[PDB]
Enzyme design. Sequence first.
Site, PDB file in Angstrom:
ATOM      1  N   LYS A 176       0.865  -1.179   0.000  1.00 45.89           N
ATOM      2  CA  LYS A 176       0.000   0.000   0.000  1.00 45.89           C
ATOM      3  C   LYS A 176       0.901   1.227   0.000  1.00 45.89           C
ATOM      4  O   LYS A 176       1.461   1.593   1.036  1.00 45.89           O
ATOM      5  CB  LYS A 176      -0.926   0.018   1.213  1.00 45.89           C
ATOM      6  CG  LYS A 176      -1.942   1.164   1.213  1.00 45.89           C
ATOM      7  CD  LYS A 176      -3.118   0.891   2.140  1.00 45.89           C
ATOM      8  CE  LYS A 176      -4.125  -0.061   1.535  1.00 45.89           C
ATOM      9  NZ  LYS A 176      -4.805   0.570   0.372  1.00 45.89           N
ATOM     10  N   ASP A 190     -18.204   2.587   4.512  1.00 46.53           N
ATOM     11  CA  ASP A 190     -18.292   2.139   3.120  1.00 46.53           C
ATOM     12  C   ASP A 190     -18.224   0.615   3.108  1.00 46.53           C
ATOM     13  O   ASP A 190     -17.173   0.005   2.904  1.00 46.53           O
ATOM     14  CB  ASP A 190     -17.186   2.763   2.278  1.00 46.53           C
ATOM     15  CG  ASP A 190     -17.448   2.640   0.790  1.00 46.53           C
ATOM     16  OD1 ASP A 190     -18.584   2.281   0.411  1.00 46.53           O
ATOM     17  OD2 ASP A 190     -16.516   2.891   0.000  1.00 46.53           O
TER      18      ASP A 190
END
Lengths: 63, 286, 135, 45, 37, 127
Positions: free
Chosen positions: B122, B213
């Site tokens: 990431k 989300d």
Amino acid sequence: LDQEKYDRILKEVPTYRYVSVSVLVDRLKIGGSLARIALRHLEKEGIIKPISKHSKQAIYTRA
Amino acid sequence: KLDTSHMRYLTTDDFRVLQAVEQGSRSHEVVPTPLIHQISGMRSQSGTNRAISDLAKLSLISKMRNVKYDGYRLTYNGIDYLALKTMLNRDTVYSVGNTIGVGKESDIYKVSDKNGNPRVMKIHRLGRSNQGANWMHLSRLAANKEYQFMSMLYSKGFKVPEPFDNSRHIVVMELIEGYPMRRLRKHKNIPKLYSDLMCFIVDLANSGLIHCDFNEFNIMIKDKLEDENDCGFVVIDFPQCISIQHQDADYYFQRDVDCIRRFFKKKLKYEPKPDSSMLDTEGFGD
Amino acid sequence: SLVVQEQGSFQHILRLLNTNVDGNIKIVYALTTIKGVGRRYSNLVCKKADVDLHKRAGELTQEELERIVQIMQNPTHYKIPAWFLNRQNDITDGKDYHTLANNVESKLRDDLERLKKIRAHRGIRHFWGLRVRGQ
Amino acid sequence: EYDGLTTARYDDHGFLPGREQTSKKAAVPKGTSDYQAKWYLDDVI
Amino acid sequence: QCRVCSSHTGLIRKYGLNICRQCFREKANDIGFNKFR
Amino acid sequence: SYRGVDLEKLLEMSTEDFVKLAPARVRRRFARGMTSKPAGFMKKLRAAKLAAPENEKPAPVRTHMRNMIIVPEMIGSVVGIYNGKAFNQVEIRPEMLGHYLGEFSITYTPVRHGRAGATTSRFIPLK
RNA sequence: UCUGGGCCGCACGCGCGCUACACUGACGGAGCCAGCGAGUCUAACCUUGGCCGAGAGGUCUUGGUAAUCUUGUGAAACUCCGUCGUGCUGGGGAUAGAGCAUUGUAAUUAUUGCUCUUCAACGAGGAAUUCCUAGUAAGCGCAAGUCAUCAGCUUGCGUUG
Ligand SMILES: [Zn+2]
């Protein structure tokens, strides 16, 4: 099963006022093709009267 | 963009000079030539010039001279490179790259270790470039706070994977052989996973974490075995989490429950027979 | 037109040529349920036999069902020519046929094993794809 | 030892050891190149 | 091909003319194509 | 069979009668014309056919065009077809009629994707 | 130079688009309105009209080297009259097979068109994101380039708005 739904159409038409194919199938009773065959047989009969005719919508009046 | 093949063109002295650049650039705004010559503590001007030219032709150090003020400017790729060198000093990254999923603020590549096990990464590129210090500093602190979030989620028995390191804004994660429900079609034991997925909401809200989300694209489902079909549910909702003390958590919670019932009534055609978990029981649970 | 309603004598779920059909939609779109027969082929088959298609499939009699079934195996005798059929100029016998619901799968399996014993690129591509995405 | 090395001695500064599990199965039609024999007996676990 | 500069790229093949665009953009006024609107 | 026709009578007619029993693509391919080198190809094909030992396979005829329609004077023959790199020795059986020769000759090894060990090991070095 | 393969091969990520998830709609008949264009010689372009064929198209002729003929490009969306009733349906048309045609020397990794069949996901789309203030957004087709054959590629035009 024919006579009782004959009585349902011949009773429901002199109750309410404005008739189209959508209003006939909003009675939760009949299909739309049979709603048109009842509409044309009813125009031949003369309980309802014509106001405006179009191929998608056609409103009528109780008499 | 990021092209990771070019940092192995550099010698030991080149990232020694790059370490001098990142040391001198955190004290002042723009570092000139003699602070790189002096802070590095190396012998010659010639080697500093050769290393600075090596970073310049690899587009890692931008030469700037604004009226008798020579200076140098770090781009994204140079600080990515020096973070990966200090990750190499922690002897774990070895071989990098297959782009699977491009996010807004975090791009996902596919890496490996010296052992050869499958891992991922990431990166964090905030702003994509008019480089200052606030963008990369905010990427660094966001990576740090999600590393503590990541370790705290992994340490409490969740089905959230294992972290290793937070090397500046470069975050190295374990690969999970998992599929989304865009690829997934049908499963044998749907009510057991639905029980697991309300229990995940229950113990997140008991911990006080509210993942917002929580769409179909969030859930990654690992297939451990092909004969017995063992399962694991991986949840990636890390920047969109909100605390339990916030004022707008109610429609977030019923949105999460409403989305999971609509997604399981749409695709798999499975209806919830127990009632929905409402907000106040989870509020007293934390 | 005129409403004609009958006391009973309509069936909900029927069965013809060992395949189930439903008797509330029209005849053509009850015959789209069976596989290998679509819309236009069923329109041509029913409009050869002087069947009124404005009425529904619940009031179909057995003598209509038997003549539809009698149309099915040899349509070529009754002015249903070559280009409407699925089996056209076949490599096995050289004639034309309309394949039925338990015969479309035999046709497909016959084509695939024929491509296997030919060892064509189409066949080895299809079985390699099936054996790889299956596993 | 240098006999059991798929790559050169650069693993301190180069690649990962690449594993090549060679599953050689022979299909016999009479006369066949490597390409068709590679297309015939592919097995995926 | 373009018979000015050996251009094998950027051809326009209209009207049997086969000039590249990078040679047409300076020879348009000598041909007769003038910038009006 | 080809059109419900027994195979031993099908071995002994000429190319025009194959066209009269052909699908539309074969008739349209015949309707324009050939070059002269398949005549030499069929000459050396029947020359290798006539030297065949009895009840065995004949001599291989190494073929290279991948666009030709199969015409069954080579029933029983065995041919090696070029793919661009190598040869695939394929014998002609009488059930493959109406087909191009190049579909017996693949062009690539297939795309493997179910191998995570070889993919992970070959990444670019980051040092 | 000669052949044969490709650049389109597919767990996949990213991006530009097309078609849809429907009844202001799908299907069948009838009404029917444009403009920007373009078009063939020492070759074969745009094609009118007549015959055949379900069609794709084939065939026989003719006009235009062009405001003259294609062409009034009788385009589509649209308008009316009938079929369908909310049911992954007759919405959708992915995939796939068979046959018939056309271009190309050569069509298989299917050039493209037609007929039948197969009728896959997909019940207004999360984080986020693009463009836009009047004949303008949007829907809709048509023309010109790439052209041997097809566009979902690009530029324009016109219709409704
Ligand atoms: Zn030029």
